[PDB]
Point group: D2
Chain length 106, copies 4
């Protein structure tokens, strides 16, 4: 899918985690977010279209998706192990990674 | 994009890194390995076909691909930084993770 | 050695990184922050003096220092590899981890 | 707190994990290993005494302790989650990190 379709998946599933009742709901939404981050990684965003593929800006853009996937790995351990409130708080902290990339490149 | 094809991609690229001429060749092989691990994670392997998706065996099988992806993230920092011999030594340490999964599930 | 002294070291070194001109200055400040977080990990804060060491609250308090030290490991690769602006932006993103612990336990 | 004393602590606690009966014994041993690896990071090993503290070899030596502590972080999630057999298998995989540093620098 294209970059804007993957951003709608990340935004919709963050809202599902905030309102979730149980572990199965939080694990399914975190899994869908990790798949959307892995697919977004191959895109070139509109503000970087004139840059080279190997530019420092394109390295920094791709790096943000590696960081988001490592944060989701840790939150999945909490959601699978009777720490669902701690996993919901971890998902709130993902917003710092979303906002950093938007401020530079959106 | 079946499990056997993803395994071929992992094995061929590990060999490219061992014999590489420069940093560009190491970075391109490590990136192909990470794409194949993200694709392999969705498979149910032949020996676990009779188990639940929520079984402790299927959680441990999926977990090995998350561990491989985090090891590749660190090796990519070394390869991009003028630390090419260090990145080739890190790629040889991935074999620990490959062998642990094979002894249990292949 | 006390928790308040370690917190002053973390805050002072964030300010040094924001004002830095070169890689050596950023790497030195990040290293001092990692040593202060590793010393704070064994402390008990005033609001948790009544709790078991194996309570969920004490597990979550110690977890925040494990997360902070992993974020400093990633920023140190950027600082060593000449990516000074990218290491400064990573240090600004640490504030998310500081703010989350303080809202729960300060 | 010398390098040889920290190494004895790492070796004794690794052996505890292999034949442990319960989660509490595996959590206590992993925590003792993380504190010994953090204290070892400040030492200069006899074979690197004539190198600069900023040499590529001293950066690689320090990096091995950062890698070991990230591996202990993930194994502590499994030991706290009722996944004691999975934590014992993760501890077997630490051996690849111990053996890679010894082959270079011991
Ligand atoms: C969970 C974290 C994230 C959330 C919730 C999120 C959410 C969104 C939303 C709702 C949009 C607007 C889509 C529209 O036009 O309707 C968007 C766009 C965008 N995002 Fe994110 N995002 C996240 C992380 C990231 C990261 C980590 C990066 C970069 C590493 C990033 C880069 C972008 C860019 C470049 C656009 C603009 C796409 C365009 O205009 O074609 N986002 N995001
Ligand atoms: C870089 C590390 C790895 C390398 C080089 C590697 C290599 C291989 C090779 C060459 C095959 C034989 C494929 C064939 O039938 O032609 C294989 C099969 C397999 N591997 Fe891996 N592997 C790696 C990591 C893993 C990991 C981490 C897991 C589990 C988390 C895993 C699970 C399997 C399974 C289940 C099969 C058997 C598939 C079948 O019989 O259909 N592998 N791998
Ligand atoms: C780089 C991130 C951090 C910065 C800049 C920072 C800064 C500070 C500052 C300036 C204080 C006030 C010290 C005083 O009253 O004298 C403080 C207190 C405190 N911090 Fe942090 N902090 C950070 C991370 C954390 C983390 C990750 C945790 C928990 C995991 C934490 C737990 C606390 C607690 C519990 C206090 C209250 C101490 C007391 O009242 O005795 N801090 N911090
Ligand atoms: C859990 C992993 C590890 C175990 C079980 C382990 C165990 C040991 C043991 C039993 C010794 C013998 C000490 C003596 O002769 O008195 C030793 C020495 C040594 N180890 Fe480790 N070790 C581990 C990880 C590491 C790592 C990661 C590094 C480097 C990053 C390292 C570097 C050394 C060096 C340099 C010596 C020689 C010290 C001397 O001769 O003064 N070790 N280790
Ligand atoms: Zn964690
Ligand atoms: Zn590293
Ligand atoms: Zn990174
Ligand atoms: Zn894990």
């Amino acid at each position: 899918a294209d970059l804007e379709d993957n951003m709608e998946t990340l935004n919709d599933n963050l809202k599902v985690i905030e309102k979730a009742d149980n572990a199965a709901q939080v694990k399914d939404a975190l899994t869908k977010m990790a798949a959307a981050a892995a697919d977004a990684w191959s895109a070139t965003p509109p503000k970087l279209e004139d840059k080279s593929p190997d530019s420092p800006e394109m390295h920094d853009f791709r790096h943000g998706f590696w960081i988001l996937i490592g944060q989701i790995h840790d939150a999945l351990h909490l959601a699978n192990c009777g720490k669902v409130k701690e996993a919901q708080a971890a998902a709130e902290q993902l917003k710092c990674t979303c906002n950093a990339c938007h401020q530079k490149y959106r």
